[PDB]
Every structure is written in structure tokens, then in C-alpha cells.
Design a protein around this ligand. Structure first.
Ligand SMILES: NC(=O)C1=CN([C@@H]2O[C@H](COP(=O)(O)OP(=O)(O)OC[C@H]3O[C@@H](n4cnc5c(N)ncnc54)[C@H](OP(=O)(O)O)[C@@H]3O)[C@@H](O)[C@H]2O)C=CC1
Ligand SMILES: NC(=O)C1=CN([C@@H]2O[C@H](COP(=O)(O)OP(=O)(O)OC[C@H]3O[C@@H](n4cnc5c(N)ncnc54)[C@H](OP(=O)(O)O)[C@@H]3O)[C@@H](O)[C@H]2O)C=CC1
Lengths: 314, 314
């Protein structure tokens, strides 16, 4: 019975890992809340690892936010994220935890990466300024992992998720994330008999989305591969693994699909007088597939089940 | 032995015509696949008609889709549909094909047409925006037919089918079409012991449905009438003929009937918190009946046989 610490087990991503893990008898989960354990406090973090007998660590605690937040508190996003990751990785090594899964993010790739983005696009160029501090912290996280793997022979692996969505997301039309923002918007419009819902932009830009439950499955699959197979499929200084569908879908498709999911009968409208972002953004998931993992939830299916959760929890 | 080209003979509607025609010794069927013949390519289309010695054409090829698709690719639905119909009708005339059956669609009528909708409701007012591009292409199709009939004395006839269903439909709860969407939904729920199945809406709205095999019979009956009887029953600038049952049935009736067809023992539930569409939508089929054709398949019978096909092909 392996002893698994899922840091930030109540976050969106962490809680999803916890659900799957929970049905595993070959696993004993060790969890703490932020009040039970502040991950910024090194001593505390060190004490925990020095007293709990941990075998694996899923590093899902982070200071995450939307466009307004990233732009409003840039110091918090870089600092907290650097400490949380430094504290954990270090304490783990010191207590001889040999297995860890680090979580990155698609938004760590350069602003003009070649699409679809392979793992080798990392660090190839300038970052999006809104995400820059946060990105830097994340990349630092990955390079810590590779470094310990290199110097000490540890097994600290990494996955770069695409845009995610699902239960426990922040469902506010206040949120900078389209799915939760849109699920909420179409919901309210549907309830108020809104004759239309307007979305800034042409709707032509292409994006990628992944249900958080696939993300969780993919993480555990990656964590649990044999070391030899994982090495075969990575390089020690290019160790991460993209996680996504590798499939595009326009914002228009997304919006109209959401509209249909919510039972909205008004008109979806695009205000093209508003600028679009880049035309295309998506991960190349060749590595993942080669390691034998393929996502299971259709957007359509995932959005439907995600809306019911919102319904069951508003 | 009349030489019959059924364009798009593998589509839902085309394949149904082909089945009935197949048992006719007075007919020689000429068929091509999309790879054997792209109908968007005029030259190709022209070459075909210039080398095959055709007597009748059943125009069943089209770019058809659901609500999300119509809303996501409006250019494809108007363009492809205009070309396919232009190419065929033109090549046929040029090679002296005198007989053709054009297929329209109930969704071409105005949003607020008077119910039940007689053929004279066409063009009387605004269209449903979701279907607008597609509708325009279809109406253009009909007016091409009437135009050639008028200028050149051809015999290019038209039928406007109601909502259809049957073998070879797209059976996905992913599909914007209730019968296939519901047949699939009740099937899965029945298999998973789902305690209930929820359908957005009150269930009070009235709609019309026709089994694709009746549609096929009705088309051939219409194609094969004598010109004189057909003229007697139409006007050259109001030539189409509605095809349906002319009978209403509520969504509630539909759902509960499907539930019973699939052997579902859970609860059918309506979420009236979701909006309904118009209260009533159906064709006036007085013309058809006057021309002596009356549908044969009960909804109940048609749904049963349609579910078995799905069972034999999932
Ligand atoms: N598209 C995206 O958002 C994706 C992000 N991820 C990865 O997962 C990470 C988290 O994402 P997500 O699950 O959405 O975020 P959540 O915010 O939903 O989860 C983060 C969790 O960390 C906990 N946490 C943060 N700081 C501390 C701390 N000092 N001590 C203890 N607990 C703390 C939070 O608790 P509390 O609220 O109590 O502060 C929360 O439960 C991201 O950083 C990213 O790399 C992966 C895939 C996609
Ligand atoms: N309720 C409804 O849906 C009804 C529709 N109809 C009429 O029948 C039409 C078709 O409906 P349906 O049978 O459901 O549709 P299908 O999509 O099932 O059939 C259309 C067929 O057209 C073929 N086709 C399309 N484009 C081309 C092309 N460029 N070259 C050659 N083949 C092509 C398709 O082949 P491929 O997939 O290989 O692209 C397919 O076999 C509708 O447009 C409508 O007017 C009539 C009654 C009801």
C-alpha cells in the first residue's frame, strides 16, 4: 500500500486525482488542508515529510488565477509558486521520497510557439506578459525536478496540461476562463429569456480543452509508468509531457455547443469589433499517446456533466 | 428500363430510395460514391451526365447537419448546397434529362408560419436564423427547378419532407435530432439502470415525424405520377409538395413512447425551467393526399423497427 500525498487535494485538479485514487486499495492517501498545513512554510513542510512516511507526491497545490489576478498581483503568483514547489521538492528529497508528479501548464510556452506545440517549444522564446511571473515559477518548478533527477537519480516527473474544465472550477461570468464563464452566462440568459448573448470577437480562433477527469487519469497513468519506459520516452533535460486532446475547436463551436448544452434558445452573437487572440493554440500530445494514453471524454459529454455539477452546486 | 441516378445514395434519405428502387425491375440504378464523384465539381458532374445516359434523377445529396453545425459552418451549408444543386440541375438539362425529384425540407418555411403549414407558406416571412443559410440554398434549389420547368418545359418536381427518422440516422445523444438523440439516451439509461432521464422543457410543444421509408415511398410516388395529374395539382411557381403525416404529437408523448420502446423502467422527467420552442410545428399534407398518397408507418411501429436497426448496428 503506497503512501500518496496529494498536495492541494481540494483544488480542482487535486480533488480530481483524489477521486480516482480514492477507489484504489493499493493506495493510502495522505492529505492536509491549508489550515492543517501551509506549504509556504518550509519548516512545516519539512516536519510533515519528516513524520509521515510518504512514497509518492502529486504536486497539485498552487496559487492560480485569471487574467485580472495575474495582472494585479504578479509578486504573489511568482513568489508563492516558487516557494511551494521549492519547499515540497526539497523536503521530499531529504526524506527520500523518490516519486513525484509536478504539474505545469500550457501557458508556460512562448507567445508565438509553433502549433501544435511539442514539448521542445519550451523556453524557445518570449512569454505572454499576463502569465509571465506565473510561467517563470512553473518552469523553475520543472527545472528543479530535472535537476534532482540528474544529480541525485530521483524520479520526479512532469505533465503540462492544456485548458481544463470540470467540477470545482470557478463558475463565474466574472472568471477569465471561457467554459465556466460561458456555462454561467448561457445559464442565466436561458433563465431570463435573454434574446441573445454577445461574445466579444470573431469566434474564429482555435483552442484546446480537456475535462479535468481526463487530466487526472493522465497524471496517474504518467506517474505510474515504469521508470524505464518513461526514460525511453523523455530526455532528462526535456522531461515534461503535454497532456490534452491535440484537437482544435473554434470559440464559435464552443459557444454554440455550450448554448445547446444549457438548453438556451436565444441567439449566440459574436462582436467582431473586438480583437481576437492568436488564431491557434494547442498541444502536440504525440509523446503521451506513444506512452499509451488517449483522452476519453468528448467536449460535448464533458460539458453536459460539468453543467449538472454546477446545477448540483450553485 | 428507366435509368435512375440517385445522387447521395448512401445518405439516410438516398439509401432509403435505393432500397425500394432496388426491387424494381423496370429500373436500372446508376450510383456513385463521393470519391467516385464529387458533386461540387461541375465539370465532373457534367462529364458524368455526358457519358451515362440518365432518364431520372433523385436529388438526395446534400450537406446536412444539426443546430451546432448549421451555426458553426454557415458558409459550408449555403455554398455546398448551392453548388451541388446548380451542378446537377444544369448538367441534367444539358443532357436532356427531363425528370428530376428535388428534396427540400420543412425548416425552409418561415419562423412564424401559420400551422399546419400549407405549401403557400413559403417565402411568406422571416426564417429561423439557425437554418437560414441552409434554407436559402434549398429555396434556391426549388426556384431553379421551377425555372427550367418554365423556360424549357422540363419535369423537375419537389417534395418538402417533415422531421424524419430511421435507419442510417446519426444515433448520438450528441445529435440535435430528438428521436436519435432520445433513442440513444434511453438506451444507455436503460443499460445503466439510470433512475431517471431528464429532458429540457415542459414537453408540451407539438411536432411532426415521419419514418424515412415512408419518405422514400412518397418520393417515388411523386416522381412517378403522370405529368398531367401533377400539374393539375400544383402551380408552376408553387410546385413543391409537403411530405408528412399532418399529425401532431407532443415531446412528452414522444419521450414516453420511446421510453416504452426501449424497455426503460426509470422515470422520464421534464425540466420546465428550460424554455420551449414554438408550441406547434407541422405540414399540411392535403396536396399529397389529394394526389393519393398516405403514410403507412405508425410512430410506434417506426420507432420499434428503428431501435432494432440501431441495435443491429451500434
Ligand atoms: N487550466 C488550468 O488551470 C490547469 C492547472 N493545472 C495545474 O494545477 C495547478 C492547480 O490548478 P487548479 O486545480 O485549477 O487550482 P486550485 O486552485 O483549484 O487548486 C490549488 C489548491 O492549492 C491549495 N493551495 C494553494 N496554496 C496553498 C498553500 N500555501 N498551502 C496549502 N494549500 C494551498 C489551494 O487551497 P486554498 O484555496 O485553501 O488556498 C487549492 O486547493 C495549476 O497551478 C496548474 O499547473 C493543471 C491543469 C490545468
Ligand atoms: N429531416 C431531414 O433531415 C430531411 C432531409 N431531407 C432531404 O435530404 C437531404 C439529405 O438528408 P439525409 O439523407 O438525412 O442526409 P445524408 O447526409 O444522410 O445524405 C446526404 C448524402 O449526400 C452525400 N453527399 C454530400 N455532399 C456530396 C458531394 N459533394 N458529392 C457526393 N456525395 C455527397 C453524402 O455523402 P458523404 O457523407 O460521403 O459526404 C451523403 O451520402 C436533406 O438535405 C433534405 O432536403 C429530406 C427529408 C428530411
Amino acid at each position: 500500500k503506497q503512501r500518496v500525498f496529494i498536495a492541494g487535494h481540494r483544488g480542482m485538479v487535486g480533488s480530481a486525482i483524489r477521486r480516482q485514487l480514492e477507489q484504489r486499495g493499493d493506495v493510502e492517501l495522505v492529505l492536509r488542508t491549508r489550515d492543517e498545513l501551509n506549504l509556504l512554510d518550509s519548516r512545516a513542510v519539512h516536519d510533515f515529510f519528516a513524520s509521515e512516511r510518504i512514497d509518492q507526491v502529486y504536486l497539485a497545490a498552487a496559487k492560480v488565477g485569471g487574467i485580472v489576478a495575474n495582472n494585479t498581483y504578479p509578486a504573489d503568483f511568482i513568489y508563492q509558486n516558487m516557494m511551494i514547489e521549492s519547499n515540497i521538492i526539497h523536503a521530499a528529497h531529504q526524506n527520500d521520497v523518490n516519486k513525484l508528479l509536478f504539474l505545469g501548464s500550457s501557458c508556460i510556452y512562448p507567445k508565438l510557439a509553433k502549433q501544435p506545440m511539442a514539448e521542445s517549444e519550451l523556453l524557445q522564446g518570449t512569454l505572454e506578459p499576463t502569465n509571465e511571473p506565473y510561467a517563470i515559477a512553473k518552469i523553475a518548478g520543472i527545472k528543479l525536478c530535472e535537476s534532482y533527477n540528474r544529480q541525485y537519480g530521483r524520479d520526479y516527473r512532469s505533465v503540462m496540461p492544456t485548458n481544463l474544465y470540470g467540477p470545482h472550477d470557478n463558475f463565474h461570468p466574472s472568471n477569465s476562463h471561457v467554459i465556466p464563464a460561458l456555462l454561467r452566462r448561457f445559464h442565466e440568459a436561458t433563465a431570463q429569456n435573454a434574446p441573445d448573448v454577445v461574445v466579444w470577437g470573431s469566434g474564429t480562433p482555435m483552442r484546446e480543452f480537456l475535462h479535468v477527469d481526463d487530466m487526472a487519469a493522465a497524471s496517474i497513468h504518467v506517474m505510474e509508468l515504469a521508470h524505464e519506459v518513461w526514460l525511453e520516452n523523455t530526455q532528462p533535460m526535456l522531461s515534461h509531457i503535454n497532456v490534452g486532446t491535440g484537437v482544435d475547436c473554434t470559440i464559435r463551436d464552443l459557444a454554440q455547443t455550450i448554448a445547446k448544452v444549457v438548453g438556451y434558445k436565444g441567439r449566440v452573437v459574436f462582436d467582431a469589433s473586438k480583437p481576437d487572440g492568436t488564431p491557434r493554440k494547442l498541444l502536440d500530445v504525440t509523446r503521451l499517446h506513444q506512452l499509451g494514453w488517449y483522452h476519453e471524454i468528448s467536449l460535448e459529454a464533458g460539458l453536459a456533466s460539468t453543467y449538472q455539477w454546477f446545477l448540483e452546486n450553485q
